[PDB]
A paper describes a structure:
The overall structure of the enzyme homodimer was highly similar to that of ferric DtpAa crystallized in a condition that did not contain imidazole. c difference maps indicated that an imidazole ligand was coordinated via an N atom to the distal position of the heme iron in one monomer of the DtpAa dimer with full occupancy. The Fe—N (imidazole) bond was 2.2 Å, while imidazole also formed two hydrogen bonds (2.7 and 2.9 Å) to Asp239 [Fig. 1(c)], and the heme pocket also contains several well ordered water molecules. Comparison with the ligand-free ferric DtpAa structure also obtained by SFX revealed that the imidazole displaces the distal water molecule from the heme and induces a number of modest structural rearrangements in the heme pocket. A second imidazole molecule is bound to the protein away from the heme pocket, forming a 2.7 Å bond to Thr351 and interacting via a bridging water with Glu283. In contrast, for monomer A no imidazole ligand was observed in the distal heme pocket and instead a water molecule is bound at a distance of 2.4 Å in a similar manner to that in the ferric DtpAa structure. The imidazole ligand provided a more challenging case owing to its smaller size in comparison to DCP and 5BR and because of the lower symmetry space group (P21) of the DtpAa crystals. For the latter reason, the merging statistics deteriorated more rapidly than for DHP. In a lower symmetry space group (DtpAa; P21), the ability to detect ligand binding in data sets of <2000 images was compromised by a lack of data completeness at higher resolution, although ligand finding was still achieved with 800 images.
Author numbering:
A (entry chain A), B (entry chain B): 55 to 416
The structure:
C-alpha cells in the first residue's frame, strides 16, 4: 500500500520492486507547439506527484464548482498509493518534432527486423510512453486515464497494454513469479539493490554521448503472443528442454535449486537460457520487467495469452539487439510470436519539486 | 481468509465474500454425446476440488513421465488458494443438446431486446459458463485455462472477460468500492449474510417449477461499456444528477451518509437509483456481483472500460428483466452501452466428494 518516492536521479519504475499490475500507454503527439508540449510535460509532472502519493489531481474529485467537470475522475478516491510508479519515455518519432532531430540519442536505435516478426503497426511505436505500475489495477488505470485527459488536444493514446500479473523480478529475495508457460521468469535478472550492475548495464552515462540522457535508460517493449495450444500439447521434457531449467523448481538442468548457477554446456544448444545468457552474448545483460496478459479469446475457441516483454538497458545496441539476434535459433520460437514492438528513451529522474519530466531535453 | 469451501447446498461464488478478481468464461459444447459430456462434468468437478484448495489438477504440474504432457499447466505453482471459487452455469442453448429441451427452466428466460442494445454476438451467449473469482488473477486464469484444456475436444471457449473490484490487501472490507465512473457501487445490494433475502430473491425453490434447479440461481451477465471520455467531460452536477447520489460520499440527494435510505421523490425522475430501486419495480431486487473491466484502448483511442454486470436472481423474469426494462429512460444511458449479454441457469451446489456439477440435471 505504501508510496514509492517520485523524485530521484532516476525515474522510479525501473529498479523499483516489480508491482502486481501494469497499464502501459503509448501516445502520439498532435500539437506542433513546442511551448504547449513543454507545458503539458509540466502539468503531467505535477499530476504524477499527486497520483504517486495517493492524492487526486488538480483541485480534487469533488467539492468544486457544480457546473464544472471535476479535475480528477475520482475512481481512485479512498485508495492507497499502492506503489504506483509512472515512468515516461520518448520514442524515436518524437525527435522529428520541436527541433529535436539532433538530440536523438545514438543509443535509441531502431530495431532490425527479426525472423518471425509479425508486428502490428497499430500496436507498435509511439511518440512517447507512460508505464504505470501499481499493486491495484484501479490505481494504474486511474493514472493513465487522468494523464490522457489532461493531455487532450496535445496527445492521443496510440495503443495501450494492461498486464494482469508480473513475469519479472528486481527482488531476488522474493518468490519468482511464473509466466503463462508455467516457468519461473525473473530468476537471473538485475536486482534493484545491485547498484554496480545498474550503472554498468541499465543507466546511461554522460560519457556515452548524449548528455541529456545521463541517468536515464532505454526501453524495449515487445508484445509476444504465446501458442498455448501447441505448448500445452508438449511433453514435460520438451518444455524443460526449451528453457534449460526444470519446471517445478526452476533450477538449471542437472541442479537442485532455482538460484544455483546455470552450467550452460549441460543445456541443449538451442535452449532459451543458454542463448540468452550474458556469457553467450559478450556479457550483454538486461533488466527484464515484463508482465503477462490475456486479451480475451482468439475467436477460434481458445484463450489468448502472451507476455508483454519490457527490457531496460544502457544502450539498445548492446543490450536487446545482440541478445534477440542470438535467439534466432531459440527452441522457444516454436511457441511464441512477436506481434508488437516499440523503443523509448527513458529520461533521467525528476530531481525535486521544481523539476519536470524531460527538462534535460527541453 | 485463504480458501472458500467448494462443497455445499449452493455453489460458492454467489453468496460468498466477493473476491478481488474475476475471470469469466463462456464455453460452447462441441460434442453431441451425452455420456462424454457427463464424463467431462465429472472430470471438471474433480479438477475444481483441487483448484479451489490450491492444488494442481490431476497428477500435477511436474514430476510425472517426462514424455507426457503435464496434467496441470503449472502457472499457479507456489500460489495460495486466494479464495478461488468456481461457479458453473448452463445457458439456454445447452438444452438443445443431449435431449434436454424439456428440462430447460422457465425461469431461464430469453432476454428481450432492450433500447440501445448493441450486442456483439461473439461476446454473447454460450452453452456454459465458469465464473472464476479469486484475489489473485493468475489463480483465476490458471483455473479457466486448465478447465479449457481438460475439456478440449468437447468444449471450446466462446468468450472470456477479466475483471477487477477492490484490492483487499490495501482496501478495507467495509469500504464500498467505486466503479470507473467514480461513484460508490454496491451500497444497496443483497448481502451474502441475508439468508432470508437470499431465499426470497436469489435461490430457486422446489415449488418454482424446475426441481433440478432447487438451490440454484439464475445469472444475467452484461458487458457494459462506459463512454469514459464523454462522462469525464460532464459537470459534477450532471454526474450526480444521473445517479441521485453525490459523488464524494455517495449519499442519496438530500441525505448525509452513504447508507441513508434514499428519498426517491428528491431525485430526478430518470435518475438511475430511482429507476432501479425495488419500490419502482414492484419489489424486484437483485444480488449484484459485478466487476469492473478495462481491456485496453479501442481503435479510436478511447478507453475500453466499463462494468461487467453480473446479477443473480430466483427468476430472470422477476429480477433483471423488470429492472432493466425500467432503465429505458435512465439518464445513465447517454454514457453506457450494453455490448455483451448472456443468461445462465446456475445449478445447486456439489453436496460432497461423490457429487458432481450438473448431477441433478443429468
Ligand atoms: C514469451 C517469451 C519469453 C518467455 C516465456 C521467456 C522465459 C524465460 C525463462 C523461463 C527464463 C529462465 C528464468 C529467468 O532467469 O528469468 C528466461 C530467462 C531469460 N530470458 Fe526469456 N523469455 C521470453 C522472452 C525473452 C526475450 C525476448 C528475451 C531477450 C530478447 C529474453 C531474455 C532472457 C534473459 C536475458 C534471460 C536470463 C538468462 C540468464 O542470464 O540466465 N527472454 N526467459
Ligand atoms: C455501467 C453501468 C452501471 C453503473 C455505472 C451503475 C451505477 C450504479 C450506482 C452508482 C448505484 C448506486 C449505488 C448502489 O446501490 O450500487 C447503482 C445502484 C443500482 N443499480 Fe446500477 N449501474 C449500472 C448499471 C445497472 C444495471 C444494468 C442494472 C440492472 C439491470 C442496475 C441496477 C442497479 C440497482 C438495482 C441498484 C440499487 C438501487 C437501489 O435499490 O437503491 N445498474 N448503480
Amino acid at each position: 500500500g505504501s508510496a514509492v518516492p517520485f523524485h530521484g536521479a532516476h525515474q522510479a519504475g525501473i529498479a523499483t520492486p516489480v508491482q502486481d499490475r501494469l497499464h502501459f500507454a503509448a501516445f502520439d503527439v498532435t500539437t506542433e507547439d513546442r511551448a504547449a508540449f513543454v507545458a503539458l510535460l509540466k502539468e503531467w509532472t505535477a499530476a504524477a506527484r499527486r497520483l504517486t502519493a495517493g492524492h487526486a489531481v488538480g483541485e480534487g474529485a469533488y467539492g468544486g464548482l457544480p457546473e464544472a467537470p471535476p479535475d480528477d475522475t475520482g475512481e481512485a478516491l479512498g485508495l492507497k498509493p499502492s506503489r504506483l510508479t509512472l515512468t515516461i519515455g520518448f520514442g524515436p518519432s518524437l525527435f522529428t518534432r520541436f527541433g529535436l532531430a539532433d538530440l536523438r540519442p545514438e543509443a535509441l536505435a531502431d530495431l532490425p527486423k527479426f525472423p518471425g516478426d509479425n508486428l502490428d503497426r497499430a500496436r507498435s511505436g509511439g511518440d512517447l510512453c507512460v508505464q504505470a505500475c501499481a499493486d491495484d489495477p484501479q490505481v494504474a488505470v486511474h493514472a493513465i486515464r487522468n494523464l490522457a485527459r489532461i493531455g487532450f488536444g496535445k496527445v492521443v493514446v496510440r495503443w495501450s497494454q494492461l498486464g494482469f500479473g508480473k513475469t519479472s523480478s528486481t527482488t531476488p529475495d522474493k518468490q519468482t513469479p511464473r509466466n503463462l508457460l508455467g516457468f519461473k521468469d525473473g530468476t537471473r535478472n538485475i536486482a534493484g539493490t545491485e547498484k554496480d550492475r545498474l550503472d554498468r548495464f541499465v543507466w546511461a552515462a554522460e560519457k556515452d554521448g548524449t548528455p541529456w540522457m545521463t541517468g536515464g535508460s532505454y526501453l524495449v517493449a515487445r508484445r509476444i503472443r504465446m501458442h498455448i495450444e501447441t505448448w500445452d500439447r508438449a511433453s514435460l521434457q520438451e518444455q524443460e528442454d526449451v528453457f534449460g531449467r526444470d519446471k517445478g523448481e526452476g533450477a538449471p538442468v542437472g541442479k537442485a535449486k532455482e538460484r544455483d548457477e546455470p552450467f550452460l554446456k549441460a543445456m541443449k544448444p538451442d535452449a532459451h537460457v543458454r542463448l540468452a545468457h550474458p556469457d553467450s552474448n559478450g556479457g550483454a545483460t538486461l533488466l527484464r520487467r515484463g508482465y503477462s496478459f490475456t486479451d480475451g479469446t482468439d475467436g477460434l475457441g481458445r484463450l489468448d495469452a502472451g507476455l508483454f516483454f519490457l527490457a531496460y538497458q544502457r544502450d539498445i545496441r548492446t543490450g536487446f539487439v545482440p541478445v534477440q539476434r542470438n535467439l534466432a535459433t531459440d527452441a522457444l520460437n516454436e511457441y511464441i510470436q512477436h506481434v508488437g514492438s516499440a523503443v523509448f528513451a527513458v529520461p533521467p529522474g525528476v530531481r525535486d519539486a521544481d523539476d519536470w519530466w524531460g527538462s534535460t531535453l527541453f
